[PDB]
Motif scaffolding. Structure first.
Motif, PDB file in Angstrom:
ATOM      1  N   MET A   1       7.570   3.543   5.469  1.00  0.00           N
ATOM      2  CA  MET A   1       8.961   3.112   5.188  1.00  0.00           C
ATOM      3  C   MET A   1       9.832   4.340   4.836  1.00  0.00           C
ATOM      4  O   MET A   1      10.997   4.427   5.285  1.00  0.00           O
ATOM      5  CB  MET A   1       8.988   2.077   4.051  1.00  0.00           C
ATOM      6  CG  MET A   1       8.236   0.770   4.337  1.00  0.00           C
ATOM      7  SD  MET A   1       8.826  -0.093   5.796  1.00  0.00           S
ATOM      8  CE  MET A   1       7.662   0.463   7.034  1.00  0.00           C
ATOM      9  N   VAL A   2       9.278   5.325   4.139  1.00  0.00           N
ATOM     10  CA  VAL A   2       9.969   6.614   3.868  1.00  0.00           C
ATOM     11  C   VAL A   2      10.324   7.275   5.193  1.00  0.00           C
ATOM     12  O   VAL A   2      11.494   7.589   5.379  1.00  0.00           O
ATOM     13  CB  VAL A   2       9.135   7.553   2.973  1.00  0.00           C
ATOM     14  CG1 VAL A   2       9.741   8.963   2.963  1.00  0.00           C
ATOM     15  CG2 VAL A   2       9.079   6.982   1.569  1.00  0.00           C
ATOM     16  N   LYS A   3       9.352   7.364   6.092  1.00  0.00           N
ATOM     17  CA  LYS A   3       9.528   8.057   7.382  1.00  0.00           C
ATOM     18  C   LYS A   3      10.544   7.285   8.212  1.00  0.00           C
ATOM     19  O   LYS A   3      11.351   7.918   8.888  1.00  0.00           O
ATOM     20  CB  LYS A   3       8.184   8.147   8.077  1.00  0.00           C
ATOM     21  CG  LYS A   3       7.323   9.255   7.505  1.00  0.00           C
ATOM     22  CD  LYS A   3       6.093   9.469   8.325  1.00  0.00           C
ATOM     23  CE  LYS A   3       5.224  10.549   7.710  1.00  0.00           C
ATOM     24  NZ  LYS A   3       4.015  10.739   8.538  1.00  0.00           N
TER      25      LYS A   3
ATOM     26  N   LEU B   1      -0.176  -0.519  -7.012  1.00  0.00           N
ATOM     27  CA  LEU B   1       1.061  -0.079  -7.711  1.00  0.00           C
ATOM     28  C   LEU B   1       1.035   1.424  -8.009  1.00  0.00           C
ATOM     29  O   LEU B   1       2.073   2.091  -7.712  1.00  0.00           O
ATOM     30  CB  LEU B   1       1.206  -0.904  -8.986  1.00  0.00           C
ATOM     31  CG  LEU B   1       2.453  -0.656  -9.825  1.00  0.00           C
ATOM     32  CD1 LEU B   1       3.721  -0.934  -9.030  1.00  0.00           C
ATOM     33  CD2 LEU B   1       2.381  -1.544 -11.060  1.00  0.00           C
ATOM     34  N   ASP B   2      -0.051   1.959  -8.586  1.00  0.00           N
ATOM     35  CA  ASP B   2      -0.077   3.400  -8.980  1.00  0.00           C
ATOM     36  C   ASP B   2       0.076   4.260  -7.719  1.00  0.00           C
ATOM     37  O   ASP B   2       0.785   5.241  -7.739  1.00  0.00           O
ATOM     38  CB  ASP B   2      -1.353   3.752  -9.754  1.00  0.00           C
ATOM     39  CG  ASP B   2      -1.532   2.934 -11.026  1.00  0.00           C
ATOM     40  OD1 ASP B   2      -0.499   2.522 -11.630  1.00  0.00           O
ATOM     41  OD2 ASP B   2      -2.706   2.626 -11.367  1.00  0.00           O
ATOM     42  N   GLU B   3      -0.547   3.829  -6.634  1.00  0.00           N
ATOM     43  CA  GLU B   3      -0.521   4.542  -5.341  1.00  0.00           C
ATOM     44  C   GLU B   3       0.910   4.477  -4.798  1.00  0.00           C
ATOM     45  O   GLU B   3       1.440   5.518  -4.433  1.00  0.00           O
ATOM     46  CB  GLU B   3      -1.570   3.915  -4.440  1.00  0.00           C
ATOM     47  CG  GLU B   3      -2.986   4.133  -4.965  1.00  0.00           C
ATOM     48  CD  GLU B   3      -3.565   3.105  -5.935  1.00  0.00           C
ATOM     49  OE1 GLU B   3      -2.819   2.227  -6.476  1.00  0.00           O
ATOM     50  OE2 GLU B   3      -4.789   3.169  -6.153  1.00  0.00           O
ATOM     51  N   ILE B   4       1.527   3.310  -4.808  1.00  0.00           N
ATOM     52  CA  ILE B   4       2.914   3.190  -4.279  1.00  0.00           C
ATOM     53  C   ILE B   4       3.814   4.087  -5.140  1.00  0.00           C
ATOM     54  O   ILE B   4       4.709   4.753  -4.575  1.00  0.00           O
ATOM     55  CB  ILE B   4       3.366   1.716  -4.197  1.00  0.00           C
ATOM     56  CG1 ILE B   4       2.531   0.936  -3.186  1.00  0.00           C
ATOM     57  CG2 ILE B   4       4.858   1.640  -3.851  1.00  0.00           C
ATOM     58  CD1 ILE B   4       2.577  -0.585  -3.322  1.00  0.00           C
ATOM     59  N   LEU B   5       3.599   4.116  -6.457  1.00  0.00           N
ATOM     60  CA  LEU B   5       4.504   4.840  -7.378  1.00  0.00           C
ATOM     61  C   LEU B   5       4.329   6.346  -7.211  1.00  0.00           C
ATOM     62  O   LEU B   5       5.195   7.105  -7.719  1.00  0.00           O
ATOM     63  CB  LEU B   5       4.174   4.449  -8.813  1.00  0.00           C
ATOM     64  CG  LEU B   5       4.701   3.098  -9.250  1.00  0.00           C
ATOM     65  CD1 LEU B   5       4.139   2.762 -10.612  1.00  0.00           C
ATOM     66  CD2 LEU B   5       6.225   3.074  -9.254  1.00  0.00           C
ATOM     67  N   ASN B   6       3.267   6.773  -6.543  1.00  0.00           N
ATOM     68  CA  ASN B   6       3.089   8.219  -6.265  1.00  0.00           C
ATOM     69  C   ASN B   6       3.697   8.622  -4.922  1.00  0.00           C
ATOM     70  O   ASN B   6       3.483   9.741  -4.546  1.00  0.00           O
ATOM     71  CB  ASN B   6       1.617   8.624  -6.293  1.00  0.00           C
ATOM     72  CG  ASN B   6       1.490   9.935  -7.019  1.00  0.00           C
ATOM     73  OD1 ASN B   6       0.910  10.880  -6.491  1.00  0.00           O
ATOM     74  ND2 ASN B   6       2.112  10.002  -8.190  1.00  0.00           N
TER      75      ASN B   6
ATOM     76  N   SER C   1       0.859  -1.207   0.000  1.00  0.00           N
ATOM     77  CA  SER C   1       0.000   0.000   0.000  1.00  0.00           C
ATOM     78  C   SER C   1       0.882   1.239   0.000  1.00  0.00           C
ATOM     79  O   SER C   1       2.069   1.121   0.493  1.00  0.00           O
ATOM     80  CB  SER C   1      -0.947   0.010   1.180  1.00  0.00           C
ATOM     81  OG  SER C   1      -0.190   0.107   2.377  1.00  0.00           O
ATOM     82  N   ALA C   2       0.310   2.363  -0.453  1.00  0.00           N
ATOM     83  CA  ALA C   2       0.914   3.711  -0.310  1.00  0.00           C
ATOM     84  C   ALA C   2       1.135   4.012   1.183  1.00  0.00           C
ATOM     85  O   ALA C   2       2.186   4.538   1.511  1.00  0.00           O
ATOM     86  CB  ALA C   2       0.080   4.771  -0.990  1.00  0.00           C
ATOM     87  N   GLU C   3       0.219   3.637   2.073  1.00  0.00           N
ATOM     88  CA  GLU C   3       0.321   3.914   3.540  1.00  0.00           C
ATOM     89  C   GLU C   3       1.591   3.225   4.062  1.00  0.00           C
ATOM     90  O   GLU C   3       2.386   3.859   4.759  1.00  0.00           O
ATOM     91  CB  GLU C   3      -0.941   3.447   4.256  1.00  0.00           C
ATOM     92  CG  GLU C   3      -2.224   4.155   3.763  1.00  0.00           C
ATOM     93  CD  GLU C   3      -2.693   3.913   2.311  1.00  0.00           C
ATOM     94  OE1 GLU C   3      -3.145   4.878   1.650  1.00  0.00           O
ATOM     95  OE2 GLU C   3      -2.565   2.795   1.811  1.00  0.00           O
ATOM     96  N   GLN C   4       1.814   1.973   3.660  1.00  0.00           N
ATOM     97  CA  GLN C   4       2.985   1.226   4.123  1.00  0.00           C
ATOM     98  C   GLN C   4       4.240   1.842   3.515  1.00  0.00           C
ATOM     99  O   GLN C   4       5.241   1.975   4.237  1.00  0.00           O
ATOM    100  CB  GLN C   4       2.794  -0.255   3.807  1.00  0.00           C
ATOM    101  CG  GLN C   4       4.009  -1.093   4.160  1.00  0.00           C
ATOM    102  CD  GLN C   4       3.795  -2.538   3.829  1.00  0.00           C
ATOM    103  OE1 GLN C   4       2.929  -2.855   3.018  1.00  0.00           O
ATOM    104  NE2 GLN C   4       4.692  -3.384   4.336  1.00  0.00           N
ATOM    105  N   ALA C   5       4.230   2.177   2.237  1.00  0.00           N
ATOM    106  CA  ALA C   5       5.392   2.809   1.578  1.00  0.00           C
ATOM    107  C   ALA C   5       5.732   4.142   2.246  1.00  0.00           C
ATOM    108  O   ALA C   5       6.928   4.403   2.486  1.00  0.00           O
ATOM    109  CB  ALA C   5       5.177   2.943   0.101  1.00  0.00           C
TER     110      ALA C   5
END
Ligand SMILES: O=C(O)C(=O)C[C@@H](O)[C@H](O)CO
Ligand SMILES: O=C(O)C(=O)C[C@@H](O)[C@H](O)CO
Ligand SMILES: O=C(O)C(=O)C[C@@H](O)[C@H](O)CO
Ligand SMILES: O=C(O)C(=O)C[C@@H](O)[C@H](O)CO
Ligand SMILES: O=C(O)C(=O)C[C@@H](O)[C@H](O)CO
Ligand SMILES: O=C(O)C(=O)C[C@@H](O)[C@H](O)CO
Ligand SMILES: [Ca+2]
Ligand SMILES: [Ca+2]
Ligand SMILES: [Mg+2]
Ligand SMILES: [Mg+2]
Ligand SMILES: [Mg+2]
Ligand SMILES: [Mg+2]
Ligand SMILES: [Mg+2]
Ligand SMILES: [Mg+2]
Lengths: 253, 253, 253, 253, 253, 253
Positions: free
Chosen positions: A106-108, A159-164, A99-103
């Motif tokens: 991981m950034v933070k 995928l589109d959400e993670i890639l954003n 998910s974008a939330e999980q990605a």
């Protein structure tokens, strides 16, 4: 001392980096791999019997050599990410991001407060060379590279959400987990799987991110490199050791 | 429990045993080698970074597998031979044996008193499985195999005398040390060296002992097997690992 | 800090000390033994898979507890004695001592120049607690205890000469090696062997030295204590672990 | 790959090299020391709890950093020298050298046959990077540096003879062993000792060899540097750790 | 090579297996246990100081012997279950399972996609012997055995629901945690606790699952075997070592 | 044997305890620190490369010395807390505690059922000395000390609530994480940060809890002791080692 420059991260935009999977879980074996001349060495904390201390020993071996180290933690666990950054892993490959939330988390996990949640312990860390890198807490975030793995249907569904997600530098496709998730366990070579991999690489690169993959199949690896895939691992130390010993014995059986 | 049968020792009289050199100095790497199906595995305590404890871990790994373990100690040191026998190494390869007097001392080093000088510590030893092998002190000497290395001009100058020592089961020729001793360091392939090796193998077998050698050269290895050489090591783990990684990188440079 | 007092050494003249053999070669197992209340623990560097580093870990474990540590090196090797003294072993048991000349060299190996040949490295040593024991180089020799093993016919042939060596604090009889040397390998219980052990203990004590022995046989151990033997080891950790697990399984088969 | 250039060895003729003693016996501690900028780091296998495997781990840590590694083995033992050269130690400091005969044997111990007695095992060795240094057996001897320690009356009694041995690059004076040998144990600061040290340095340099010494006393260290002493160790990691922690506590007692 | 047959798993339906708890956290101690002849050995990752790497060393030791290995991870952590399966542990005992939902997640954690969520990394895994088991990804699931512990009131409150989970092979009752949860900490022998254990065993077997338990009390162990309990651990290595050393010392005080 | 008395816990009400941070992650380094005479030693499992097994080795080293061990786990992970308590850590410092709900969970994690959720494994644990502390399961909770760290805005936003949690013995302020959270990363010296620290210490002590902090700044450390701060760490081993080596080199550059 200035912070160690993350050449793997810079090269994600300038060339195609050839990698070797390091699963022998040993500083001595990691040094043998480091002499060969791979662009990157993946120190596998997910599928090889590694812990923070064995990964540190392999970072120390590899550090004398131009090959860039990438560490795969066993999961996207914030405290473990903290530990691997402090021993001086500058590039991480997070498994099973879905998910974008999980990605975003991981950034933070890779960035100091107040922008991130990376625990601060620079006096203690090989990462700052125990504060011998005097501006480490100011310069650290810039040389950290975050790669995430898409290797489930849920990941492809997001995928589109993670890639954003700003701060994801690269998405790596794991054909083993993905082929299994798709119901072709042990047969990633199937057209149904390959067409999904190719489309996924095209989408990754179209969103301005680096794409990565592993294939021990030379033809599949050169195919992924012709598509522009930025980071391609082309074999696995445990597999090369076992195959070279088997092939030699076969000449004498 | 009966004592572990030394099939390597028995097979010196019945077949030609194919070997792999184990210098990765690690219980996990030793296990990978143990899966391949070599007749013997040489755990190198002379030229790999091993000690008693790392050799023990490799014996424990290899023990689940048919491959026979042979241990090369760093030198013909009587106390060290005592330590390797107690951790349960049943076949030893002694480097740089240069006289019948030294070979006889190596024989005694492997045998309990009163006939030999092997220290008695059966309660403590993996060799006795901590006395779970109840007759170990009576059955031990029969399953111990002593190999010696001839790899100097002085050894070749004493070859007939070494071959007359009862208790030497085999003489291994090390082409690296031998070619260097003969003034062809790095070039064992030279006809002057090869004629000395062939005559040496012939003299060893003529005296009823097993002859052994290592060559990573397939042609030389098969030539030595055609002469009836009883134990032939055909490769080295560190070399196979490095060459397989280098050959793979070269397909992508 | 004052130098650690060697209570084992003092008690050689004031009581009979009960010992346990430690051959599990592990800091964690050594600590378990340390909790029991034995007078002394023999860390076996001769017949268990130990090196300087594993013996150090076991000294560190045992140090919190009243039990006194005694280290047996693999042989009477002067440089190895240097290493064991510097990691802080204050009592050594030298195996296979066979002459007054060898015993005198073992004395010297344990004392600083100019009277002995012990290498000086107090800044680096746990023995000096890295110079936190400020007068270590003046006070070290007093708290070092030298024991030698007589366990061969040659040792028995030189017993009076070994007992005349100033600096040997104690002679330990090893019935395993001694029974083997006498041609009764695995059967120290024989009267021929036992008469020689009793006479040996008597001669040791008559010369003002401490006598020691190991027997796992309760009756032999109490017989040796009735003779006044000063240091008696009454079991082995490997044997007790194996026997207690076997006896338990036997109740359930 | 060309052989690693031994800059310590080259600099013996061009500058005065400042050193740090590394006795913390740990790859992680060795890396901390390697970040500081010392010309050389002495990895102490004589007076710190090191073995071949722990020394390898410290070579691997240090290799990423400009500091040159020097290894002190526990004694001038030919097989141990063989092991330390194969793990890639390019400079050795042999303790307690006492004759030209012993110094000549240490020269041979460092050189391949036919000129020396160094065992040949380049396929297995970090020293050749597992034959990734393709001409290693031809180029090795040139980058090996042999230092010997004079630290006994017998050594001083044989100084002119040792200084005439071709292949001894340097003589290191150990004030601890030497002050003790001279009957001033723990007091190397005494004029009787210092005058002998100064004369010894002058003789070493007059014979065209590099002189070396250790002093944690800043005034003595700068005095030895004013005499032209080529390799001066100015402290010890274990001492600096203990002293810095003691001094800090004292501010708060 | 065919996949290792999980004989523990098969024997859950054909016999009563006698077990030993292994908490000495060491490959050498694990091998000593392996020699005794227990049906199963529990490598305790929950209450002994073990990690993935030390559990691997103990699997390698035990693998040469008939005793079946069972690993208890610290908790039902999916990524840790992934790691233990890849090092080749074929039977897992999950502590503190408290719901059908948690038990179902533990089932999935042990099976490959698409039916489960076990991470795919067969090339790297001792479990596949680095793909030397050629059909591993097709045959793995059949030889995996999942045991769960019920050791809390909540677990007892969900027992019928846990027993209805397809994929749970066995429920193990831990009397220490259970007696503590019931307010009888340190006194599992109380009738209130024992009646609950007997009823629990009966319900487990009535639902067609294997029941297991540990008791060091011989009488309680034989009572549990008379009830038909399928896997009964009858002692602990730490306890037997400590008790056998204490009982010995008591004969001499 | 009675349970080890936690003098650190008792001294929270009677004196001001001076601390040293231990991040060298090594039993040998921990012992050097243990000799100095600090009231407490913080074994850092968050920001140094430690795991359960390396923390155990450091507890064993330190145990012979008066200095009290405190362990910081990588996070407030209940299973990891269970593991550190069983290896015998009696005082825990939990990082990044941000709510009363989390603090209460940490309290329970430290206490046996039925009042807490600490897993029961006394037969196996160094904490019980393998049940040689016969009443351990009744006496354990009394000698456990729980410290929590407030080092985020969310923690400061919940400080009153955290200070009302029975079972929290002390709150430690980490100026590195706190200054970073407050947007002064690397600059805890700033008046905005310092006023927040002083008010926090005052509120902690006003609520009857012990306040703790680390500063390597002597002036700030003495300021915090003047406020009555109960546990003050005044330095870090890695920092003292690096600074002492750098300051020494600078005298010679
Ligand atoms: O590249 C992939 O597919 C991975 O994510 C991991 C690797 O371990 C493979 O599974 C090899 O078996
Ligand atoms: O087989 C031989 O020649 C040996 O005795 C040892 C081996 O280490 C080789 O030298 C590899 O370089
Ligand atoms: O006590 C003795 O006889 C020894 O010197 C060593 C001990 O290991 C025994 O040999 C046990 O087998
Ligand atoms: O420099 C010397 O004198 C040495 O040879 C070794 C060193 O360990 C000192 O003895 C410090 O105690
Ligand atoms: O069998 C049980 O009760 C367990 O689950 C664990 C074991 O460690 C005991 O607690 C021993 O104290
Ligand atoms: O004391 C603090 O601030 C901590 O919580 C941890 C310590 O690692 C420091 O951050 C050192 O950099
Ligand atoms: Ca070792
Ligand atoms: Ca570990
Ligand atoms: Mg994957
Ligand atoms: Mg050779
Ligand atoms: Mg003996
Ligand atoms: Mg010296
Ligand atoms: Mg339990
Ligand atoms: Mg912090």
């Amino acid at each position: 001392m200035v912070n160690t420059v993350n050449y793997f991260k810079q090269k994600l935009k300038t060339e195609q980096q050839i990698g070797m999977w390091v699963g022998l879980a040993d500083g001595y074996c990691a040094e043998i791999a480091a002499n060969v001349g791979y662009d990157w060495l993946l120190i596998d904390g997910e599928h090889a019997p590694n812990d923070v201390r064995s990964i540190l020993a392999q970072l120390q071996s590899i550090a004398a050599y131009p090959s860039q180290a990438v560490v795969r933690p066993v999961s996207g666990d914030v405290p473990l990410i903290k530990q691997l950054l402090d021993i001086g892993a500058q590039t991480l490959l997070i498994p099973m991001v879905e998910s974008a939330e999980q990605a975003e988390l991981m950034v933070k996990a890779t960035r100091y407060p107040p922008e991130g949640i990376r625990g601060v312990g620079a006096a203690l860390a090989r990462a700052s060379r125990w504060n011998n890198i005097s501006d480490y807490l100011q310069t650290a975030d810039e040389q950290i590279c975050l790669l995430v793995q898409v290797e489930s249907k849920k990941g492809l569904d997001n995928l589109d959400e993670i890639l954003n997600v700003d701060g994801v530098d690269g998405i790596f496709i794991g054909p083993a987990d993905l082929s299994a998730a798709l119901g072709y366990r042990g047969n990633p070579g199937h057209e149904f799987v390959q067409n999904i991999i190719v489309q996924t690489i095209q989408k990754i690169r179209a969103a301005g991110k680096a794409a990565g993959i592993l294939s021990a199949d030379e033809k599949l690896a050169k195919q992924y490199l012709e598509l522009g895939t930025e980071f391609v691992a082309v074999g696995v130390d445990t597999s090369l050791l076992m195959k070279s010993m088997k092939q030699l014995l076969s000449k004498f059986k």
